[PDB]
């Protein structure tokens, strides 16, 4: 039986096997259709397939709500190459084409197998007629909500349009619903299940955050009389893990300020570890230079703002050290996780000072209240704040670092085996926190 899945995956989409074991399970449980389904994988862990493929293997049509026209086009083009008759009804569509597709959707055996559609379109009463005749003939095998996170106000990109989708799902009792996003805290997940009226049990396929080979720890800048030297020592332990090869691989140090990058890259260089500053302040050429130097391991350490790491794809990144705490636990996972891509053991470390925290907490309250004066009030302004607080907690609390990150993102207790300062030495991390008290 499962072969028709493998068969179509290969014969249509031209991959022999799935991208990850979870993609297989997700797609396979969408196939059965006995449960509604949530898929939460980072962009490009192959979420599209988890519905694009079952859509072809199902009796009737598969309708896909995607929030932007931009996103729809990308997929239509790709599906058209796979010789799939995929249609899109949106804002952008031509007066004649609109009426010509509507006619197609009315035919017994409509040419369309997969209909992509704006949430705007889905609510518009001008469309409800087409919807009803399809609902009537029970010609819906699957409803799919892409970018499910737009239903939540705690999401980064709430679209009111998406609130109406849940009522529609209930009208489509016949068919299972598939909901997908990359980004969902547990509060966003429950918001996604509630406001879409998904039918329990919901099978959830959620790419966990935990990575076996990464050792997270936190050091408290205020406890360290030679901080620049402590960072140097750290960078070298991490790079120095092939005694015969000397410096194997490279690492990143993340800073807030462009100033601090320039300054720190220097302090590190002089203290032993060759390092170059990267940030949007530099000339396009000087950047591509510093990247390339870092890339070919000519200069193994790069001190950068959140500019850097965007599509780097350097595998052997042995350390990611945050000189300044990050604006969000979101940001810290993304930043730190550029480490150890090749899967060889790596070190993520966060330099916490209360002095840093206060600066940032201040700057978020400014940038937020500045937003509330320009665009008025929002609920995602609280997620913005609580997102930072979660990371401060991570530093100010005793307890497994991977667990702490798993908690925030809604991942199951992770299999951390002496893979974080706390689990390795719970007492010494207590000793170090007890100490931060006395500073102030």
């Amino acid at each position, epitope marked *: 039986p499962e072969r028709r899945v493998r068969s179509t995956l290969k014969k249509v989409f031209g991959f022999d096997s799935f991208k990850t074991p979870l993609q297989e399970s997700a797609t396979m449980a969408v196939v059965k259709g006995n449960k509604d389904v949530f898929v939460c994988m980072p962009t490009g862990a192959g979420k599209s397939l988890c519905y694009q493929l079952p859509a072809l293997l199902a009796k009737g049509i598969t309708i896909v709500v995607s929030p932007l026209i931009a996103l729809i086009q990308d997929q239509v083009d790709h599906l058209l190459t796979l010789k799939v008759r995929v249609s899109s009804l949106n804002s952008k569509l031509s007066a004649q084409e609109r009426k010509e597709l509507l006619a197609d959707l009315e035919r017994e055996k409509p040419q369309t197998k997969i209909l992509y559609i704006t949430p705007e379109m889905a609510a518009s009463s001008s469309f409800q007629p087409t919807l009803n005749s399809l609902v009537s003939r029970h010609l819906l095998s699957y409803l799919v909500v892409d970018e499910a996170h737009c239903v939540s106000q705690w999401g980064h990109d709430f679209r009111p349009d998406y609130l109406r989708l849940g009522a529609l799902r209930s009208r489509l009792g016949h068919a299972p619903c598939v909901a997908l996003t990359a980004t969902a805290t547990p509060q966003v997940q429950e918001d996604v299940f509630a406001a879409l009226h998904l039918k*329990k049990p919901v099978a*959830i396929f959620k*790419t*966990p955050c935990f990575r076996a080979n990464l050792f997270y720890d936190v050091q408290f800048k205020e406890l360290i009389s030679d901080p620049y030297g402590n960072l140097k020592d750290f960078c070298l332990k991490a790079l120095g893990q092939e005694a015969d090869k000397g410096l194997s691989g490279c690492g990143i140090v993340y800073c807030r300020t462009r100033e601090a990058c320039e300054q720190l890259a220097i302090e590190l260089s002089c203290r032993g570890v060759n390092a170059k500053a990267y940030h949007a302040g530099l000339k396009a050429s000087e950047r591509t230079l510093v990247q390339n130097d870092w890339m070919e391991e000519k200069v193994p350490v790069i001190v950068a703002t959140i500019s850097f790491g965007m599509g780097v794809d350097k595998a052997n990144v042995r350390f990611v050290a945050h000189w300044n705490i990050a604006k969000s636990m979101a940001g810290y996972y993304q930043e730190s996780g550029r480490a150890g891509r090749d899967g060889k053991p790596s070190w993520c470390r966060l330099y916490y000072s209360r002095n840093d925290r206060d600066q940032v907490s201040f700057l978020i309250r400014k940038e937020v209240a500045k937003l509330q004066e320009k665009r008025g009030n929002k609920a995602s302004d609280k997620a913005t704040i609580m997102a930072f607080d979660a990371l401060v907690t991570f530093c100010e609390e005793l307890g497994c670092r991977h667990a702490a990150i798993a908690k925030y993102f*809604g*991942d*199951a207790l992770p299999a951390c085996a002496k893979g974080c300062d706390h689990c390795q030495n719970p007492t010494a991390v207590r000793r170090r926190l007890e100490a931060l008290e006395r500073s102030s």
Partner: nanobody, 124 residues
């Protein structure tokens, strides 16, 4: 799937107290709400009390000020302290875990509601 197990039921002289419990076992991350219900023989099920994540409580008027709903969220175990028991309180008390989020380290996980067998309360 998840085992809801009630405990602490019994007979008491009216005016007495009981303390009922609800252990949810399984790969549980969080539960939207746990609600205590009572069903007397051939009588409609009655909503007694509810606790959400963050300890937001909600109680029926029939019981407000006699009943107290606690949670050791560490033990994922909710309690109903029942003081001043009346014979009208006699029924089968059971919890529902509403919005129950299980997950595996693998990323496979289930959001479902889950219902206990019950425990008998009887008041002379």
């Amino acid at each position: 799937q998840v085992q809801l197990v009630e405990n602490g039921g019994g007979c008491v002289q009216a005016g007495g107290s009981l303390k009922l419990s609800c252990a949810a076992s399984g790969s549980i991350f969080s539960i939207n709400r746990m609600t205590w219900y009572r069903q007397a023989p051939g009588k409609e099920r009655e909503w007694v009390a509810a606790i959400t994540s963050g300890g937001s409580t909600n109680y029926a008027y029939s019981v407000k000020g006699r009943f107290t709903i606690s949670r050791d969220n560490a033990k994922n175990t909710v309690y109903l302290q029942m003081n001043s028991l009346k014979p009208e309180d006699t029924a089968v008390y059971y919890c529902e875990a509403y919005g129950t989020y299980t997950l595996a380290p693998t990323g496979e996980g289930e959001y479902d509601d889950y219902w206990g067998q019950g425990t008998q309360v009887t008041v002379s």
